[PDB]
C-alpha cells in the first residue's frame, strides 16, 4: 500500500476517478473554464495509470493533495484571476492545501443557466460523456462544498432524463418538468452538505458525530448501540474527508460503507432489501433516503437508564461522549417523529444537566427530574409554526417572502442586501414545503429546513462579518440557531441608512428581466427601503407596495417605457418619502 494514487484508481475505476477529480478542480477553481480543467483531469489520469503499472515510478508515493496541489500551481492564470490564492503555492503541505480550501467562494457570482431544450438535446447526442462532465463542472463550481459522490449520482440521473426525453416529439414538455424537480433536490442536497461541513470546521468532530447518532438511530431503531457506533465512525470519516477535499478517499469509503451495511441487513434494518440491489451510486443514495424501521415492541422506559440509576454520574464521567451517545441513540430510536434539529437539543440540554447536577453533593435529587425539564423543550416551537402557517396561507409564497424580508431586515439591518434577499426568499419556501403537511408533522419539517437556511446566512455572513447579532447566534451553538434568531428583536441601536436615490431608480429593463429577477429586483429595493426607514409601520409599507405595483404595471404598458419611468419615478419617491417621513 505504497502508492495512494494507485490504490484509489483501482478501487473506483477510471470513469469515477475522472469524475471526482473534475469535481475537486471545479470546487478549487470555480471561475476557470471547463476545457482547462479537462486537460488537468486528463493529465493527472494518465499519471495515475502509470503508477498502477509501475508503483516505484517517481512521484507515485506522494500524498493526494500534493499531486493535486502540484498541478494547481502550474496554472498560468492563478494570480491574475484568483489574487491572493497564488501565495498558497509558496507554502509546503499541508499548510498549502489548507490555504486553497480557505478560498472556496460560497457566492461565486456565476451566471444563471437558462437551459434551452433544443440546443441542450443537441449537445447530449454530440457526446454523451462530455455533456456528463459539463453538468459536473457547472454544479460543482457554484457549490464548492457539495457532497461529491452524490454529484455523480445526480449526474447519471441527469443523462437519464435526456435518454428518455430527447426521443419524444415535444422535448420541452418532457425536459423542463424533470430538471426543475431535480434542481430543487440538488440545492437541498448542497445546503445539507454545507451544514455538515460547517459543523466540523466550526464546532468539531463531536458535533457532526452526534448528528449521525440522531439520524441513524432514528432510521435504524432495531440496530443495537454497538452497531450504530460502528456506522457513525465510518460515516463521520466519509463526511470529514469529503468536506476536506479528500474526494477520492471519501467516495471509496462511502462505497465500503454501503457494502458493509447491505451485508449486515439483518442486524440493521428490514427496509434495505430493495435499496441493496441497485448499482453503486443508486444504492448509496437509496440507503440515505430509506424509510425508517419499526420501533421495537418492549422498549424499556427512557427514565430507567438516565434518571433513576444511582450511578448516572459515574457512568457519565468514565465515558462522557459514549454515555451521551448512548442517550441520543436511546432517544432517537424511540422517537422518529422528532426532527433531528430537536433531538440534539435534548441531548445538549441533558449534557448541561449532568455537568451541574454531578457537581452538587446530592446529584440524585438534581437529575432525577431532568425529563420534566426536557419535555418542555418540545412544546416551545409549537406555536411558531401556526402563526407562520396562518400568515403563509393568507398572503401566499411571494407575499410571504416580502413578509419575512420586512420582519428580518428590522432584526439585523447591518447585513448586506443580497444576503437578506436570498435568505428571506428561502425561508418563505419553507412554508410551501412544510405548512401543507399534516399538523403534527409541520414542526419537524420547519426546524429541519430552517437549520439548513440559517446555516446559509451564517456561511454567507462569516465571509464578511458586519452584524454582531448574527455572529452571536451563529457561533454560540449549532443547535440553538433557530430559537436564537427567532428571539432577536428590532434594536434601536441601529442608525438608519442615508437616502440613496440610485437604490430606488427604475428603468424599462424591469419589464424584460426573468420572473425570478423581477421579484429579486423588487425585493432588493424593499430591503433598502427598511434600511433607510427601519420603523415604518405595516400600514405604510402596505401603501408603498401597492403604489409600486401600480407604478410598474403603468409604465410597462405605455408606448414609451423610458419616458414613463422618467416621469413617474420621481413621483413615487416623493409620495413614499412623504408617507414614511
Ligand atoms: C469497478 N472496479 C474496477 C472494481 C473492481 C474490483 C473491486 C474490488 C473490490 C473489493 C475486492 C475484495 C477485496 C478483498 N477481499 C477479501 C474480497 C474482495 C472493491 C471495488 C472494486 C471495484
Ligand atoms: C452518458 N451515459 C448515460 C453513460 C452511460 C454509460 C456510462 C458508463 C461509464 C463507465 C463506468 C465504468 C467504467 C469502467 N469501470 C471499471 C467501472 C465503471 C461511465 C459513464 C457512462 C455514461
Ligand atoms: C387558530 N386556529 C386553530 C386556526 C388555524 C388555522 C386556520 C386557518 C385558516 C385559513 C385561512 C385561509 C383561508 C383561505 N385561504 C385562501 C388562505 C388561508 C383560518 C383559521 C385558522 C385558525
UniProtKB/Swiss-Prot annotation:
Its main location: secreted. Pfam families: Serum_albumin (PF00273). Residues 1-183, 184-376, 377-574 form the Albumin domain. Phosphorylated by FAM20C in the extracellular medium. The modification N6-methyllysine is found at residue 531. Ca(2+) 2 binds at residues 11, 252, 256. The keyword Nucleotidyltransferase does not apply. It is found in: Secreted. The keyword Oxidoreductase does not apply. GO terms for molecular function: DNA binding; enterobactin binding; fatty acid binding; metal ion binding; pyridoxal phosphate binding; toxic substance binding. The modification N6-succinyllysine is found at residues 202, 561. The modification Phosphothreonine is found at residues 81, 417, 419, 543. Belongs to the ALB/AFP/VDB family. This is Albumin. It comes from Bos taurus.
Amino acid at each position: 500500500h505504497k502508492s495512494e494514487i494507485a490504490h484509489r484508481f483501482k478501487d473506483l475505476g477510471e470513469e469515477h476517478f475522472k469524475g471526482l477529480v473534475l469535481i475537486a478542480f471545479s470546487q478549487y477553481l470555480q471561475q476557470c473554464p471547463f476545457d482547462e480543467h479537462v486537460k488537468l483531469v486528463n493529465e493527472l489520469t494518465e499519471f495515475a495509470k502509470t503508477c498502477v503499472a509501475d508503483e516505484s515510478h517517481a512521484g507515485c508515493e506522494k500524498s493526494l493533495h500534493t499531486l493535486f496541489g502540484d498541478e494547481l500551481c502550474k496554472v498560468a492564470s492563478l494570480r491574475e484571476t484568483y489574487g491572493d490564492m497564488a501565495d498558497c503555492c509558496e507554502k509546503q503541505e499541508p499548510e498549502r492545501n489548507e490555504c486553497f480550501l480557505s478560498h472556496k467562494d460560497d457566492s461565486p457570482d456565476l451566471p444563471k443557466l437558462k437551459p434551452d431544450p433544443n440546443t441542450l438535446c443537441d449537445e447530449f447526442k454530440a457526446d454523451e460523456k462530455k455533456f456528463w462532465g459539463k453538468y459536473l463542472y457547472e454544479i460543482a463550481r457554484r457549490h464548492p462544498y457539495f457532497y461529491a459522490p452524490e454529484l455523480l449520482y445526480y449526474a447519471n440521473k441527469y443523462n437519464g432524463v435526456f435518454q428518455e426525453c430527447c426521443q419524444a416529439e415535444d422535448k420541452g414538455a418532457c425536459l423542463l418538468p424533470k430538471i426543475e424537480t431535480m434542481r430543487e433536490k440538488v440545492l437541498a442536497s448542497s445546503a445539507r452538505q454545507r451544514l455538515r461541513c460547517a459543523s466540523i470546521q466550526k464546532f468539531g468532530e463531536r458535533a457532526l458525530k452526534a448528528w449521525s447518532v440522531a439520524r441513524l438511530s432514528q432510521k435504524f431503531p432495531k440496530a443495537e448501540f454497538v452497531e450504530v457506533t460502528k456506522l457513525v465512525t465510518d460515516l463521520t470519516k466519509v463526511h470529514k474527508e469529503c468536506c476536506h477535499g479528500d474526494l477520492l478517499e471519501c467516495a471509496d469509503d462511502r462505497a465500503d460503507l454501503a457494502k458493509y451495511i447491505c451485508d449486515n441487513q439483518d442486524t440493521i434494518s428490514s427496509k434495505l432489501k430493495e435499496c441493496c440491489d441497485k448499482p453503486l451510486l443508486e444504492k448509496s443514495h437509496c440507503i440515505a433516503e430509506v424509510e425508517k424501521d419499526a420501533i421495537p415492541e418492549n422498549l424499556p422506559p427512557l427514565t430507567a437508564d438516565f434518571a433513576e440509576d444511582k450511578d448516572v454520574c459515574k457512568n457519565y464521567q468514565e465515558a462522557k461522549d459514549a454515555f451521551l451517545g448512548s442517550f441520543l441513540y436511546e432517544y432517537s430510536r424511540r422517537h422518529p417523529e422528532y426532527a433531528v434539529s430537536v433531538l440534539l437539543r435534548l441531548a445538549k440540554e441533558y449534557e448541561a444537566t449532568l455537568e451541574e447536577c454531578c457537581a452538587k453533593d446530592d446529584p440524585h435529587a438534581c437529575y432525577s427530574t431532568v425529563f420534566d425539564k426536557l419535555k418542555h423543550l418540545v412544546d416551545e416551537p409549537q406555536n411558531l409554526i401556526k402563526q407562520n402557517c396562518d400568515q403563509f396561507e393568507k398572503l401566499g409564497e411571494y407575499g410571504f417572502q416580502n413578509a419575512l424580508i420586512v420582519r428580518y431586515t428590522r432584526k439585523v439591518p447591518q447585513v448586506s442586501t443580497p444576503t437578506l434577499v436570498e435568505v428571506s426568499r428561502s425561508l418563505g419556501k419553507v412554508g410551501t414545503r412544510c405548512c401543507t403537511k399534516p399538523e403534527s408533522e409541520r414542526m419537524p419539517c420547519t426546524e429541519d429546513y430552517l437549520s439548513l437556511i440559517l446555516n446559509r446566512l451564517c456561511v454567507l455572513h462569516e465571509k464578511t462579518p458586519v452584524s454582531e447579532k448574527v455572529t452571536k447566534c451563529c457561533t454560540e451553538s449549532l443547535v440553538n440557531r433557530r430559537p436564537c434568531f427567532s428571539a432577536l428583536t428590532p434594536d434601536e441601536t441601529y442608525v438608519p441608512k442615508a437616502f440613496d436615490e440610485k437604490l430606488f431608480t427604475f428603468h424599462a429593463d424591469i419589464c424584460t428581466l426573468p420572473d425570478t429577477e423581477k421579484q429579486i429586483k423588487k425585493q432588493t429595493a424593499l430591503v433598502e427601503l427598511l434600511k433607510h426607514k427601519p420603523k415604518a409601520t405595516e400600514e405604510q409599507l402596505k401603501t408603498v407596495m401597492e403604489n409600486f405595483v401600480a407604478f410598474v404595471d403603468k409604465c410597462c404598458a405605455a408606448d414609451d417605457k423610458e419616458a414613463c419611468f422618467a416621469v413617474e419615478g420621481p413621483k413615487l419617491v416623493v409620495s413614499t418619502q412623504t408617507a414614511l417621513a
